[PDB]
Amino acid sequence: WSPYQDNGGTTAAIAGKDFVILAGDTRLNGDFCLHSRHDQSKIFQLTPYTYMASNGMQADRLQLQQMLKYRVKWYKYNNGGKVPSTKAIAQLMSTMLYHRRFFPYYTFNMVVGLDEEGHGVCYSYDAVGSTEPFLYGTRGSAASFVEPLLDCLINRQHMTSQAPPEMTKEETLAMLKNAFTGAAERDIYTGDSVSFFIITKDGVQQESFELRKD
């Protein structure tokens, strides 16, 4: 008996100019069986413009979500109703991840939200809290599949062709759908149905997308 376990899954975000597309696959698998195909315990909404999407062990992320939600509530009560910013939430989460440094959380996290000037930004953490702000990013078992694909269509390196126009919500959504349909066909633990969260300034919308069930 070891207190750790990996429940597979994957998540991936792309930040735009005034939005962020967050995506997480809804699939929960245990030791060798498949617990559920409707697992919605990956993407957790902290504030109306901030989300945390985490992979790894499921109990640890169900615990960390509550710890972060209560820290956000304390911050809201002490500051007279001022909902914290994405930057504050990301630094808070790093500090929280490092306190349990000797019996760690088995999660890999992303704090996806909007900055103050309106631009969207993503964060990425290790198991202990090495945060780094960035513009896209994927975590989970399907990381080494999706990351190099996005690296090649967004950064547009190694192509002697003038940079295309800035990608909008629909184009980014389609690109991320491509990435997930491609990763659901080569990873055994990934993909029964993915959930997309389009975070914009006038609130957030939500969509689903269906993959192969094998």
């Binding site: 911050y75 002490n78 500051n79 007279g80 001022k82 914290p84 910013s85 930057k87 504050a88 990301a90 630094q91 808070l92 500090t95």
Partner: protein, 235 residues
């Protein structure tokens, strides 16, 4: 006298110790604070015991953070520990949440200590008496320039123009008039220095008093040197 304890209630409902500690405030040096759309201003009289003291050692205006200043009155022996507390809490809030603390949160963190008095130790060590000091915090956060006040009660109160210390009674008289809501920082300078001129037994000198200002656009604390106070008196 020790007949009634530290936690006894008076027949009028107010605790004896906190009612006495508020009386000790009017024995101290006066102080001001004026909030304006451009910034906030904190003025105070050092009230040196002799002409020999190097006055820059009895600064009544302590910096709690690059955007949060605090002026006190009463017994300045305690106020230093309240200021170290506010500094530690503000630095923690910058270390954890990575952004400047809000002034009202600093005032909460100060009263949270100032309430913890009692006599029975048991689990936690307490203060044997309230702090005989009434702070006055001022700062600039996203909610604009803000001035908060604190009593030994543990009761924090946001204001627009307040006076503590001895000559605060006539100071509130000078306050009720001569103060609209949308003044200029220079107008606040003139008004505060006038008040100090009015309610002090000593003669107002650029080395006699201390003035600090926190401007909104800059968003930083800017303590005045004697020459700048001379520039204000010459107006």
């Amino acid at each position: 006298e020790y007949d009634r304890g530290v936690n006894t209630f008076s027949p009028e409902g107010r605790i004896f110790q906190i009612e006495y500690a508020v009386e000790a405030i009017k024995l101290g040096s006066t102080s001001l604070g004026i909030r304006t759309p451009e910034g906030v201003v904190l003025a105070a009289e050092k009230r040196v015991p002799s002409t020999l003291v190097v006055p820059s050692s009895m600064s009544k205006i302590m910096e709690v953070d690059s955007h949060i200043a605090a002026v006190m009155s009463g017994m300045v022996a305690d106020a230093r520990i309240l200021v170290e507390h506010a500094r530690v809490e503000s630095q923690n809030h910058r270390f954890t949440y990575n952004e400047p603390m809000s002034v009202e949160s600093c005032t909460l963190a100060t009263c949270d200590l100032s309430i913890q008095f009692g006599e029975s130790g048991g689990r936690r060590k307490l203060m044997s008496r309230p702090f005989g000091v009434s702070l006055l915090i001022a700062g600039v956060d996203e909610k604009g320039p803000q001035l908060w006040q604190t009593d030994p009660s543990g009761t924090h109160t946001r204001y627009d123009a307040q006076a503590i210390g001895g000559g605060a009674e006539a100071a509130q008289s000078v306050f009720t008039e001569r103060y609209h809501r949308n003044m200029t920082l220079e107008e606040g300078e003139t008004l505060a220095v006038d008040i100090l001129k009015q309610v002090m037994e000593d003669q107002l000198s650029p080395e006699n008093i201390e003035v600090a200002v926190v401007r909104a656009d800059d968003g930083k604390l800017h303590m005045y040197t004697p020459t700048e106070i001379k520039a204000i008196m010459s107006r």
